[PDB]
Structures are given as C-alpha cells and as structure tokens.
Design goal:
The structure is cut from a larger assembly and holds 2 copies of chain A (203 residues) and 7 copies of chain C (227 residues). Chain A contains 5 helices and 12 strands. By secondary structure, chain A is an alpha+beta fold. Chain A has one domain: Aminohydrolase, N-terminal nucleophile (Ntn) domain (Glutamine Phosphoribosylpyrophosphate, subunit 1, domain 1, 4-Layer Sandwich). Classes of the chains: A alpha+beta (203), C alpha+beta (227). It is classed as hydrolase/hydrolase activator.
Chain lengths: 203, 203, 227, 227, 227, 227, 227, 227, 227
Amino acid sequence: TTTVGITLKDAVIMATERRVTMENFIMHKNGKKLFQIDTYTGMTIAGLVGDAQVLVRYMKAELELYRLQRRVNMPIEAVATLLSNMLNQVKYMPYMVQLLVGGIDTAPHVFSIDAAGGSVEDIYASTGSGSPFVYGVLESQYSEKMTVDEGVDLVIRAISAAKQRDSASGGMIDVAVITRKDGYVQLPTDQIESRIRKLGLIL
Amino acid sequence: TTTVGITLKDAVIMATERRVTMENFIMHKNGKKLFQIDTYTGMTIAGLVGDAQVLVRYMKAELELYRLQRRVNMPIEAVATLLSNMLNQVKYMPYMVQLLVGGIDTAPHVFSIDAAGGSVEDIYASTGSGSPFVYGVLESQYSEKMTVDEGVDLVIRAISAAKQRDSASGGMIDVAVITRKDGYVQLPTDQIESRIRKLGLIL
Amino acid sequence: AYDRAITVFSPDGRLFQVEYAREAVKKGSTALGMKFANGVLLISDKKVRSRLIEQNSIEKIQLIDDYVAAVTSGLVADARVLVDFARISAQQEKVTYGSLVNIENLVKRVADQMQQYTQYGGVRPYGVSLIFAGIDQIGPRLFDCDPAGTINEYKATAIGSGKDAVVSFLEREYKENLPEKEAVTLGIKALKSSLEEGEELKAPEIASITVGNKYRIYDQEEVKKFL
Amino acid sequence: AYDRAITVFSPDGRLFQVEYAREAVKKGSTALGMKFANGVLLISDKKVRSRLIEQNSIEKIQLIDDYVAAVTSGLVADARVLVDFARISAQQEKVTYGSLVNIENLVKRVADQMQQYTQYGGVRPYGVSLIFAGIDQIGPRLFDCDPAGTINEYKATAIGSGKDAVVSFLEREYKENLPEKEAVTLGIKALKSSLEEGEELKAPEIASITVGNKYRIYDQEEVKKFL
Amino acid sequence: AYDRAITVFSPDGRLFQVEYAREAVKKGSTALGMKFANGVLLISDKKVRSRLIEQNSIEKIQLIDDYVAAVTSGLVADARVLVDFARISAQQEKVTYGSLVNIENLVKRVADQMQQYTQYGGVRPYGVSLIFAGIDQIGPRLFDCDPAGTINEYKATAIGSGKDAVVSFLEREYKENLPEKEAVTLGIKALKSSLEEGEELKAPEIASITVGNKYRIYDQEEVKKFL
Amino acid sequence: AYDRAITVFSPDGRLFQVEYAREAVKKGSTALGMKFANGVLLISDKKVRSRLIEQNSIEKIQLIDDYVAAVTSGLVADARVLVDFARISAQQEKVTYGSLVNIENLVKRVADQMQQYTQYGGVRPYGVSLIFAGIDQIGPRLFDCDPAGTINEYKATAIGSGKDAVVSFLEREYKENLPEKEAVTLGIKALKSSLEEGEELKAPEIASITVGNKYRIYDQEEVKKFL
Amino acid sequence: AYDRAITVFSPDGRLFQVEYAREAVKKGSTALGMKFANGVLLISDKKVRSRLIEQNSIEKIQLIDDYVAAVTSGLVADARVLVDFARISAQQEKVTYGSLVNIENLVKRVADQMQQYTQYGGVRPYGVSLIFAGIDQIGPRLFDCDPAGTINEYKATAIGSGKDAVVSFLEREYKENLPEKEAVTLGIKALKSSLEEGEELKAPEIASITVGNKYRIYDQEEVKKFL
Amino acid sequence: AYDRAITVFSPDGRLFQVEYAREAVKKGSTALGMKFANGVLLISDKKVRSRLIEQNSIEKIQLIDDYVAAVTSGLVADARVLVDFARISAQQEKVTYGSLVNIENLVKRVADQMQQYTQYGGVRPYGVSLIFAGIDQIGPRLFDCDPAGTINEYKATAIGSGKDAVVSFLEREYKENLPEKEAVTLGIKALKSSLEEGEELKAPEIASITVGNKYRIYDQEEVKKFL
Amino acid sequence: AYDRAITVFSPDGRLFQVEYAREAVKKGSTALGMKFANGVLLISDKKVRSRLIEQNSIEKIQLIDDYVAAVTSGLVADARVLVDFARISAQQEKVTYGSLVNIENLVKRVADQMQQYTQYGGVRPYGVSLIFAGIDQIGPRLFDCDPAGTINEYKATAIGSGKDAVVSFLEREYKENLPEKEAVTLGIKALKSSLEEGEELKAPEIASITVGNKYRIYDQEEVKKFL
C-alpha cells in the first residue's frame, strides 16, 4: 500500500493506490484506501483491511455525531487526538493500521497516527509499504510554495514511483483535494489519467 | 475449495465445487458451498466448515428479519458491511473463513470478505485453495460484455481448471444466476452437465 | 387511585399516567410537517419570549443526520435526551449496515425506548412528542411519535398546543405533491389558523429536504417572505 | 384494594390487574382468522381515521416469517414490542434447529414472556392479544394469546371490540375445509355482522397462506371484490 | 390488611395470599389419579367450550417424560410454566445420574420452586395445583402439589372444582390393586359423582402406565367405551 | 401497625411478625424428644387424615445423616426447605473436616439461616420449629430451634399444638438415664396426655440412636407394642 | 397526592416535585451574567452574614476551567456536587479531543445529569440553578440551567431570589456590545434594583473574560469603585 | 408515623426505631462487668427456667478469644450472630497483624456493623447490647456497645433489665483496684440489689482475667461460695 | 407528609428530613474552634456523666492526622463512622500525592459523602456536624460541615446545643491574631456564656496547632489553669 498526504498554503492533497494483496497474491486491484470522513476531512488507511475499514466507519459516525452536537466540525487535531486515544486504549490488542488524517479547520493539517496511538503533525506524510519511495520523491521535489495543480502532480509522481518499486502497491491512483472553498473534492479518473499522460508515466 | 462470483451488466453468477477434505482425505464429495441468503442474494463459503455453516445460518436469519422489519431487502453492500463488523468484532478468536457475497439491488455486486472482516467489492472474485487457478482463467477470458450464458460457461471452465490442479477441490460444479427478473435461480444439474459436455471437459 | 403509578391499569384498561404525560405535550408550541413533491418539510412555531434570549441558539428543529430531522413538543429536557438518543441510534445503524435504509426503524427504536418507560415501575414516561421527517430508500417520510411509544406515518401532521387547529385545517386544505413554496405557504397558513386572532405569527423555523439532497434550514429572511 | 398490584390475589383467586389488561384489548379494532382447505387466513378491520395518515404503512397484520403471521389488538406500542419479540424468537429457533417444526412453540415463548409480566411486581402486563396463523410441519395452525399468557388453538377466532359478534356469527356459520374465496367471504360477512348497522366496512387487511406456499397479502383491489 | 402481601403473617400464623392462590385452583376443572395393580392412571375432565376450539390440541394431561405425567388445575399460563419447569428439571436429573430413580425428588424440586414464591416479596404464588403420576424404581407413584409447595403421596386423589365430591366418593369406593379397566371405571364414576345432576360427562382425558412400560394416552374412542 | 413488617420493632421492643411465625408452629401436630441412657429418641404424632394417603411415605422424622435426625412442626413446605438445608450443611461440614464433631454447630447454621429471615425486609420468616437429636463427640444431643433462630439444648422437649401438655407432663414425670423401652413408654404417655380425652393416639413415628450406633426407625409393629 | 414522587405526572402533565426543586433555587441570593463587547461577565450578590466567616473563601462564582465559569443558586451542597461534575466533565472532553470547542455541550452534559434525577424514582432533583459563561470557538457564551435540566442561551440573565427584578430591569436597560466597565455598571444597577430599598448592596463577586484571554476575578477594591 | 422506619428522623432528630431496638435489650437478664486490680470480670444472671434445660450448655458469657470475652442482653438469635461476628473479626485482626493490640478496635468493628443497620432501609437494628472485657496491650478493658452502635469504656457497667439498679449501686459502692475476691463480692451484692426482694439469686456465670493470664470461667461450686 | 422521605421536596423547596437530621446535632454538647496568631484551636465541652465512665478514653476531639483534627456533635455512632471516613480519605490523598496540600478538599470529600445520603432513598442522613481544624499549605484552616453536606470556612465557629450562645459571644468578643493563651481564654469564656447560670463548666478538651508544628492535646491540668 502507498498513501500520501501533503499540505499547501490553503489546501490539503491526499492520495492512495488501490491494490489489495494476501502476501504476493493480488486479490483486488481496486480497493478503496482514501475516504471522506467529514466536510473538510479525509482519511487514508494502510495495514490490516478489516481493522482499517471498521475505523473508517467509526470515524464517519463519530464526526457526524460531533458536528450535529456542536454545530461545528471537529478540529483536525481533535480527530487525531480521538484516534490517538482509541488506538492506545487497545494497544495490547491493537488496530493493526497506519492512518493519515488530513483536513482544513482554521488552517490545513496532516496527521500521521500509528497502531499504538502515536500521532504527529507534519507538512507531509506517507504510509504503507511504498512510503519510503514516496518520501524520496517528496524530499527532492516538494515545495511549500507549490500550487494545488503542482501538488496533485507531485503526489501522482510519488505514488507512481512507489508503484514501480513496491509490489504491494498498484492500481489506479486516487486523489482528493481539500479546500475551504470547495470542501473535500475527490478528483475524477479522467483528470488523474490525463495528468499521468501529461507527466509521461504508467499503471 | 473453489468458489467464484462474477458480475455482468444485469446479473451475478456464483459457483462452487463440493469437495470436503480433512487434509488429503476426501471425506465428502458433495458438500454444499453456495447458498441463497435473501431474495436476490447469494453467499459462497470457504475455510473451516463449522464456522462457515454457522455464518450461513446467521445471515439467513439476520436478512430475513431485516426484510420483514424494513420491507426492503438489505442492500448487498449492507450485507457485506454487516459481515465485516461481525468478523472483525471477533478477529482474535475468528471465524476462519473466506466469504463471497453476491446479489442485485439497484445494480449487481460481488463482495469478498476475509477472516478479519476486510471486505472489498470487485467485478469478480474467487476464494479457496483453487482460487489462483480461477484467477488465471478469469484474467484471460472474462469480459464485462459477456452474456449470462457466456458467464455460466466461463465459471464452469474456471472451476474445472481449479479442480484439475487443486486436490482440495472436486465434485459437481454448482451454479446460481441472480437477476432482478427471475431472482436467485440455482441452475439444475442436467444443465450444468450438458455444458460440461458441450465445452468438452471432466469430473 | 388508578392514577398514580405507570404500572396500574384502570378497570377500563387505561394507563392514566401515560395519558397525563400526553398532556405535557400540549403545553408545547405547535410544530408541523408535510410531504410535498419529492420532499418533506417541517415548520415550528417558537414561543419567542424576551429579547435577552439568544434566538439563533435554542430552537425546536434538530437534525438527526443530514437526511433526517425532528421537532419535539413537551418537556424540553426530556426532548433533548430523546433527540440525543435518536442521533446515537442513527449512527449505530450506519456503522452496522453502512446506511439508514428505512427511517421507520430509527423511529421505532426511539418509540421502543419510550414504551419501556410506560411499563416498568421506577420511571415516569417522557413528556414529549416528536415529528420525524427525512428521505430514505423508500422515499420522503413523515412520522410522529408520542409518550406512549405510538407511531404513525403521515402525509401531514402536527404536535403541540395548536395540534387540532392545524390538523383540521390541513384536513380541509392539504393536497399531495405541491411544489415546495406552495407547501410552505399552506403550512404557514395552517399554523396561523391555530393562533388566537389579534395574535401575530412571529418568524418560525422551517427545514426542508428533497430527494437526492441534504436538509436545508431556511434562514430568518427567507422565512419572512412568507409572513 | 385487591385491584392495584399485579402480584395480589383477590380472596376468590383473581388477578384483577390482569383482567384490566384484558380490557385494553377490547378497545382495539376487530381482527379474525380461520382455517380453510389446506390453509389459514387473517382479516383485520382497520379503524381508518383521516386522509392525512399513510395507509399502505401502519397496519395490523405483520409477518413473523414467510410462513407465520400475527394480528394484534390493544395498546399499539405494546403490540409492536411483542411482534418484534415474536420475530427474534422465531429466528432463534431457526438458527438452533434449521427450521420451525411446530408454530405452537413460538406462540408459547411469546405467551411465557407475557405470563412473566403477570407475576413479578415492578412491571405491568402487556395490554395486547395476538392471533398467530401459519403453516408448519403439523399443518395449518391458528392460535390466540392474551395478556395473561393464555393460549388456545382454533379453527376460527377473533380479537378486539367486535370479538363476540364475530365469534357467535362464526359459531353459527363456520364450516371446515372451505375453499379460500368462500373462507374470505364468510370472514367479511362475520366482520360486517359486528358493526353498528348504518356503518359501512371500509377495506380491511387480508393475508392467506396454503400448504407448500408462502404468505400472500391481498392488495386493496383484490379485497374490494369482496366488499 | 394481613391479606395483601405474600410476606405477611396474620396474627394466627396464616399466609392468606397463599390461601387465595389456592382458590384459583378451585376454578379449574376436576382431574384425578389413582394407583391400581402394577400401575397408576390419570383422568381429567375437560370443560369443553366451543366447537371452534381445536380439541386434539390444548389439554390438561402432559407427559413429563415417557414414565411420568402431570395434570394441573388453576391458572393455565402458570400451569404451562410449571410443566416446562418439571420437564427441564427431569432432564437435568437424567443428565446428572443417567436416570430418575425416585419421582418424589422431581416433585420436590417443583414444590420448592413454588414455596419460594410464597416467601420473597416481589412475586405472587403460582395459582396451580398439580398431580404427578408415573413409575420409578420404588414403584408406581402418585403425588399432588399445591400453590404452597405442599406435597403428598396418595393411592388416589383429585384437584380442581370437583375435588371434594371426587375425594369422598373415592374414600367410600376405592380399592387397591384393581385391574386397569376396573380402575378406569371407578374413576369415571367418581368424576360423574361430582357433576350437577342433569349434566352429562363429555369425553375426558385418560392416561395410564403399568410397570415395565411407557405411558399410553387413551384415544377418544377407547374412552367412550366407559361413558 | 407495628405488626406488618419483619423489620419494625414495636415500642416495647417486639417483632410481632416473628411472633406470628411462631403461631404457625402451633398448628402442627406434636412431636417430642428425650435423652435417655446413652441415647436420644424422637416421637412424632402424625395427624393421619385419610386412607387414600400413602402412610409409609410423607412423615415428620427425617434423618439429617446416619447419626442426626430432625422433626419439624409448622408450615410443611418451609419445613422441607429447612431439612434440605440442614442436610447440605451437614455434608459441607463433613467435607471440610472429615466429620461432624459438635451437632450444636449444625443447628446454629440452621438457626442463623432462620434469624436472617427475621432481619431483612423482602422476606418472611420460616413458620417452622425443629427438634434435632443425635450423637456426636460430646455425647447424645437434643436441641430445638424456632422461627426466630432461637436455640436451646434439652433433656426433653416438644414442639407443635400439644407442646405445653407434653412439656408439663415431662416436667413432672421425666427422669434421666432411663433404659430405651422405659423412655419410649414415658414418651407415649406424655403424648397421650396432650390429646382431647375420648381421642385415641394412632401409631406415631419413633426413632432412636444410642452411643456407637446409627439411627434406627421403629417400624409400625414395634410401635404398636407401646400403644 | 400528585405531589410527592418525582415519577408522577399530574393530570395536567406537570411534575410538581421538579417545580418544588425550583423553589429551592429562589432561596439563593441573586447572581447574573451578561454578554458585552467581545466578552461575558458574572456578578453575584453574596448574602454576607457574619464577620466570623472567612469571606475570601466560600463564594458563588467558580471557575470550571480558565475559559469557563459558573454561578449557582439554591441548595449549596447540591451546587458543589454539580460544579465538581462540571469540572470533571470539562476535563473529560479536553482529554478526548484536546479542547472544548462548544461550551454548549459541557452545559448539556450537566443538564442531562440533572434531567436524570427528574425521571427515576429513588432520587430527588438537584435544588440548583446554574449560569455558565465563557469563551469558546463560537464566541462568548452565556447559558443557564435549572433543576429540570432546561437550558437556554442568553445575552443576559439572572438566577436566585431577585431574578425577576434583575430580568425586567435588564429587559428595559440592556444593550449589546457595551464596553466592559459600562456592562459592569449596568449589572451593579440591575442588582441594586432588586434589593428592598433602605438596603445597601455590599461588595459582590465579579468575573469577566474577553476573547483571546483567560478569566479574571475582580478583587474587592476594584469592585468598590462601582458601588 | 416518625416511628416505623429506621431511616426516618423525627422532627426533634430522633430515630425511634433504634430507641425501640433498645427496649429489646431491657427484656434480657442483667449482666455486669468491672475492672479490678490488674484484671476485669464479668458476672451474668441467668433467668433459669426449667429443669429440662441443659444448664452447662446455653449461657450468656462467651469467649471471643483467650483474652477477651463478651456478655449480651436482648434478642438471643441476634446476640449469637453478633458474637460470631466478634469472633471472626478478632481472628481477622490476628491474621493481619499477628495480635490484637487494642480491644477497642474489635469493639468498634462490631459497633460499626450495628450502626450500619440503623442507617440503610431494608434492615432492622440488632436488639442487643454487649459488654466486652479483656486484657490487651493498653491493659484491662471494659466496653459496652448498644443497638445504635454507641461505645463506651467503663470501670464498671451493666446491661439488661436490672441495669439501673446495678449501676446506681456501683456508683455508690464501687472502688478501683479491689482484689479479685472482693470485686466478685461487690458484683454479687450489686446484682442482688436489682432483684425484687423475696427473690433469691440463683447461681450466676462468672469469668475473670488478670494481666499475663488467660480467661478463667468459675465453675458452679466456686460461684456458690459467694451466694 | 412532605416530611417522611429524604427524596421528597416540600412545595417551598425544603428537605425536612435533612432539617431534622440537623436537630440531632443540637442534642450534642457544644464544641468550638477559632483561628489565632499562626494557629487554630478546638475546645469541646464534655457532658461528664458518671464517675464509672473512663474519662481519658471516649472524647470528642479526634486527630485526623498529625496536622488536622475534628470535633463532632450529634449521633455518636454516626460521628465515629464519619471520623473514620475522614481518616481513610486523608491517607488516600497522602498516598496519591505524597501530602495534603489543601484541607478544604478532605472536608469536601466528607461533605460529599454526607450530601449523597440526602439524595438517594434507602438511606437516612448522618445526624452529625463536624468542625475540622488544621494547618495546610494555605495556612491555618477552620471548617464546619453539617448533615446536608454544607461547608463553610470560619475564623471562629461552634456546633452543638450551645452553638448560638457561643457564636453571638464570639461575634461580639472575637479578634484575629490573638496569642494562643488569650485565644484559649476567650474560648473558655464563650463556652461558659452558653451554660445555664448556676452551672459550672467542668474540664473541657483543648487541642491546638501552630504553623510548622504538630497538634498538641492539652492535658487536664493545663486546662484547669483556665477554669
């Protein structure tokens, strides 16, 4: 699996690929690993699919509830703190996952949460077996000053590189942009494919 | 075991074979691995027989109840989400199974669920020891544009191939077609055998 | 004294304490809902009661999720507790199945909670009635639910002091499949028909939802255009 | 005051609070069932009560599974809770044994639940009667069940306000092994015999099941052909 | 008010609420049992009560296992619950030891269950009496058991409305070690002696068991030969 | 009303409900025990009450183990429950220590069970008195125990309706260390002295135990030799 | 007696015991709060009552955290328990989410705790009202909360004996967005307007908070400058 | 009715049900204890009450361990339960610390058990008073303890019917540090002073303990030397 | 009967049962405490009541730890239980944090325990008031605490029968920062001022603590120097 989340001045870009393996056996080429979980919040999942999928549903429920009760969206750091507490509560029988939580409140944020509830904020983050390859691309090519279009291209490149070198990663690249203005928009497939061609790439 | 579920434009085809082994010892040649669990829903089971059989009964019960309470059938994705929650709830003392759930609601669907509750939708899926051989046949020969008759032939071929190379698979091939028009129809044995002959095959 | 304990039947088979809980509902200000063309709406009168209150806060229409809303009438604290139960119950269903196929079952779970409190000594009933309106996989839905745990589905209904005025008016004037603006007008009329004449209807709450959309709450200025 | 507590016997050995629960049942609208040739049916009057109600929704015949149905009369919220119990209880038996061999045992479990609530202080009885009808491995079955937890199997019976009218009429006119259409006619006649004359029977609910089939609910237009 | 609570003794050391439960038993129809040569039997009058009832169903003699049966009189729902208890209790003993050596202990367990409900507030007594008859390793047995939990072993006894008529008749006419057919005749006579003259005994239930056999239920036609 | 609740003291420091439990004991038939030379015995009158009862069955002397016996008087079902408690309690001691060194402690455990039911609301007392007699490591023992949980050790005592007649007679005629046959005669005399004259003592129960032996129950014919 | 149990409705749908709890609140000294320009404040009269009391100790404004405070009126011990609940509840939210986004939810949790104690027999309501004021992510907030669990958000409000004097005065004189010093003056005036004339207002408590700051408690000398 | 429930205060702040428990204590026969030179003693009158009782058995002084004894007065069964609690409680302390440093704490644990039963509804108080006497690491100790859980340490005291006679006599005649034989004589005199004249004191119980020794119970013949 | 149940409010919002608990406190002998220069003290009158009591034992001032003490007035057994709770509660805080920073929190925990017993049916309140005095990190502290769970901090206060005499005297004569000996004298004077004239104050208990020291209990001879 490869997931990535980056922040720019007023945006958050999150992307994943879609491969699901049982060992070397590619059982599903189009699983879903990027989810909207609130108006301006997205989550990526890596690790044990069952544990991840349960957590996706809990977060959808818990944030929808919070928003009705409070009439404001949960702060992104509050979402991360909630996951932090849930995962740590069960550390000795853990959710075997790596989570990225990204969104906009008064500012853009990306948080990376591990299976023991450790949560750290960062300007960018990647998770899954393909993440080291993404970290390479991002160290070399990421700028804070990037435009949203430049960011979408950057993540497409990072995940394309990870797909080329991690057999546990593959399938269509899946991208969401999160802005105050339009909210959580999942880019359409035409558009992603189009940029894969314009950048000169594959899968 | 070999089970398979495929989707076509307005149909779902599900098939299994019937062998039950304790190690190399073929104890039963005609066990049942394909079950109707709702008006337009079917389930295939692989893995520990006892765990599977319990789950078949639960799902029959839980979907019948739902239907009476809601006056609509459970959405196929809802059935998968239910199984997802149930299996994950007990992940450390798991149901040692692989499940396929297929059916029609507003569209055709096939879902594959694992022993930790991970559920992924796909245009086709196979489970059991014989599944890799089925995946071979399907990669080469499946078309979205296939007719129901072509689909039935395709699954018969896939399962026949798996029977030839997986000693844990064998016995009569067992096929169900699910359409909005006729519901869950289990094909009769005359008819399956007839196509085994017309395609030129064995067991 | 067939009158003093939720667990005592009268010789005619009545549960007077439940019927008294129902009188609590009558002290609430009127609210109503009606189905219209591909949608359903809610209007609630608000007994506005001092300029020192924050208006944009405490208010009778409450979203249960994006596709389902409720209005209540009766004891406020009881109402709040029931609306929270409705919200949690909705999310439990969504986690179990991935969605809320039939709003009737949410309502039943709330109605069951309420029935319980009419059968075991040691508790009193909730002095609340609710209207629930939303869109589900069957279509646009409108239910009410009373202190007894009694449920009914309606094309239009009301709760609160002005119930009877608003219901007979709607029995006369109501038509199915109105466009939204005509539905709202009919509603405002019906609500007005329940006031003591020489008594002006101040700005009520209005919320609507149409198939394939989320709920929208009308803001005050949109509402005034109907007054 | 031998009258106020479910746990107190009168000096004659009566449980008046249970008997009062039974008066609640009398306020419900009449329903009936009868066995006929290879089958059993249910007919329920519906106190139709406003054009603003959704008719095709809230209704007294409820499927327990595909082969067993119930009608209830009395407190509606109580009835709902008992029908849900019946449903869950049915599925528990199906999961344990793979099928429901004798419908009598389902009814007994519901009747036992009801009897409990006539013996322990702290609860009131359910103000409900039920008729259960279906096909099982013995054949077509028809039971009733009252607030006391009392069960009986019948060839034909009724529950609700018009019980006695409908029962004496059937005592006169009923015959075993009628074809379905004649059974339904007899039923409609019996139900009519219980109305205040100069009072027209509106469209009732009708459901039937015959050996080797599932239940079918008659739709309104099929029912009118009998009115 | 020494009269209103199962936990209150009167100044004379009486538990009137238990005594009232005992009046419930008197409203039941008469049943009786007697020991005869190498065996024991039960006969139960059935208050037959409408042609619309299913006769071959609901009936007062109930097998506890193949070697032990019970008749009850009083509140029907209570009786049902106690018969189920008896059945489960019998099987518990069989699983623990492999068989049921002494029927007296089964009866004691049922009687203990009943005594409990005469000592803890929050419950009422069971309004039931039971006769138990069967064969065990001691021989043919016949016990009764009342709402108080009181047990006695008899050569012959009865329960229900006609108890006293049937008991004094048996006190006069009864003899030990009759053959089965004479026992049954004596029983039918005794039962008849308890009816209001100009009142005909309709077909009762009869069950018998003789050493080294299982229980047999007489079918209607075998019974008529004694009427 | 200082009279209606086990947990209420009267202003004089009385527990009338406990005292009423004690009146229950007076309605039982008389039984007695006395110590004699190297032994202790029990005699119980049996209110024999119909030839249809099985005599050799239900009877008031009960072995607690081979070396300890009890007679009871009062509510029969209560007595049964207490005798079972006594039996289980005896075996618990035997398992813990390998034997029952002092019978007083068994009696205390039973008496403590009874005292509990005079101190916590929600229960009534047991309407039973017991005499316990047996041999232990101290010697031959004779205790009684009443509904209050009050214990006393005696040389001779009685319980039941004829208590006072039997006690004053023994206060006059009793001597320590009689041989067994003289003890039994004295006992039969005492029992007879408590009957309404022109009333014949029918065959009572007699059980005895002497140091270094197990209990023996006299059979009817051995008893008649004393009548 | 519709009057004596928290779980009993009157025939008009009232819970008098809750209403009586509310009378406890009227015996407390008056306190008030009002929103002003970018802030909110609290003023509490203190019934000063002996020079032997420690003043700088026991006092009615209590910080719930650095950004939220409460005043209470009614039974002191009850108030203390509720303030502690408020504090713990606040920290639970902070630990779960990292911060307290909407003060309304803290208040609701306290109000829910209070509503519970108006629905289950076995407890009485809290005889307390609270005003909560603070800054959150919505802005400056002001709520009250009564023994029934009723919540409202205000621009200005009061609790205690002088409630009505202080509320009508504010209904006349109150204006939004005053600077802090004018707000405090208005407050002191309003409070004075509730006293019996020829009765001097002694030094009250005053606390304020403005956006982007923590609460500050005015010390006595700062307060006197307004007296 | 400020009189009927352990949990109800009278308007003067009295717990009459506890005061009534205290009347139970007055019905017991008198006992007393006094400290003397390096020791403490207990004397108990025994209402001797028939030659058929075993004397050397049931008796009021009870060893709690070798160094601590108790006498009780009031309800006997209650007394027994409390002495057993005392004994178990003593051993718990010995197991925890290896010894019993201060007898006061044993007494407090018993007194606490008693106080509990004066505060929670659902139980009645113990109708018992106890005197505790023994040697500990402080020295010779003498406490009493009543149904309220009230404790006091004395040089000399009494409990039972003759309390006031025995206490005023000791108030007059008592001196500290008497030798044992003079102490006993003084005690016997005091006890005699509480009898109706023309009423002879029969043999009482006497136990004593002196520093560095275990308790000794005087046998009858040693006691008579003082009569 | 707004008078009989801890959970019932009167129509004026009173809890009379709590108020009656408060009358229990008035029957205790007077005690007082006052802050002085760098310290705090306690004086307790002791209703001395017979030369047969042990004086140097049972006494009203109790150390909670070395730096904190309490006096109580009211029901003695209740007081004992509350002082033990205070002691355990103090040690729990010490184990958790290593020390007792603010005595106010210890007092609150005891006050909370007391408030509980004024809100849940099934218990009565404690009939006790306490004064707590000690040194903590804030300084010298003095609190009282009543049956309602009401707390106050004082410079000087009293509890018991003579409360009002002692409080008004101190309202007149009390000054802050007296040296210890003058504080004690003032206290003795205040206590004397509460006696019936022609009634001598016998030796009271006195305890004091000054910053940087442990408590000291004045011995009798040190106390007499003030009498």
